[PDB]
Amino acid sequence: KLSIAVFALGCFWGPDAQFGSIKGVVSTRVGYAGGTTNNPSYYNLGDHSDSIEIQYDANVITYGELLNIFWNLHNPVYETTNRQYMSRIFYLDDGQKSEALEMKRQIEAANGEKIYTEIVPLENFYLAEGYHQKYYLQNTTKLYQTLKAIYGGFGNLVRSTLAARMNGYIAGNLSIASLKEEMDLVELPEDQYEKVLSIVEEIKL
Numbered sequence: 001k002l003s004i005a006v007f008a009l010g011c012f013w014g015p016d017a018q019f020g021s022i023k024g025v026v027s028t029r030v031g032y033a034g035g036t037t038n039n040p041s042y043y044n045l046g047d048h049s050d051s052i053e054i055q056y057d058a059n060v061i062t063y064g065e066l067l068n069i070f071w072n073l074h075n076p077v078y079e080t081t082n083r084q085y086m087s088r089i090f091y092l093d094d095g096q097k098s099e100a101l102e103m104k105r106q107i108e109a110a111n112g113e114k115i116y117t118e119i120v121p122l123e124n125f126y127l128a129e130g131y132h133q134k135y136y137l138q139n140t141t142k143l144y145q146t147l148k149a150i151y152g153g154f155g156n157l158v159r160s161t162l163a164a165r166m167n168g169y170i171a172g173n174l175s176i177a178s179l180k181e182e183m184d185l186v187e188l189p190e191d192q193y194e195k196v197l198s199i200v201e202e203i204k205l
Ligand SMILES: C[S@](=O)CC[C@H](N)C(=O)O
Pocket: 011, 012, 013
């Protein structure tokens, strides 16, 4: 049992890699939310926004810390009607709602600009296509294939904490030192630890 935040802040690849680099974030998935059609998809998006579902351990990171990361990944100071990329916070309860509203007020005071992020109730979140998940990792072929065999397949891999961290590492959002600690948590057999580590070290160059 973990806590859930659902945010929208533009194309979801960067957010996936950024939030997935953070201690306390257990898993991420990208998808679509905020519209009024069931089962949207990339070429049939309707009025939905590109969104990220963050599953986090509230004992380790708070919703307030996640909102602060959210507002540091983009600066939503213009009003657009482009639903696919609109800045939105989908609250799952009234505590999330009030923390978001308060933090939005603080930001507007501290920097002087109106924030256009819509703070709205989460209705339905729909998972994006598999090719959008852990996008940087998926497109780093050897590392991906190795990790995928270790986790037992695509679904198990992309739902894992280590994939979230690896994806963030490839994207440039996590140090190799922190990544290595994460690899340590998984307790791989020595040989697999070494295969993964040499790919990762080769990526650092
Ligand atoms: C998920 S974003 O809307 C897609 C952006 C585009 N395919 C690109 O590679 O630049």
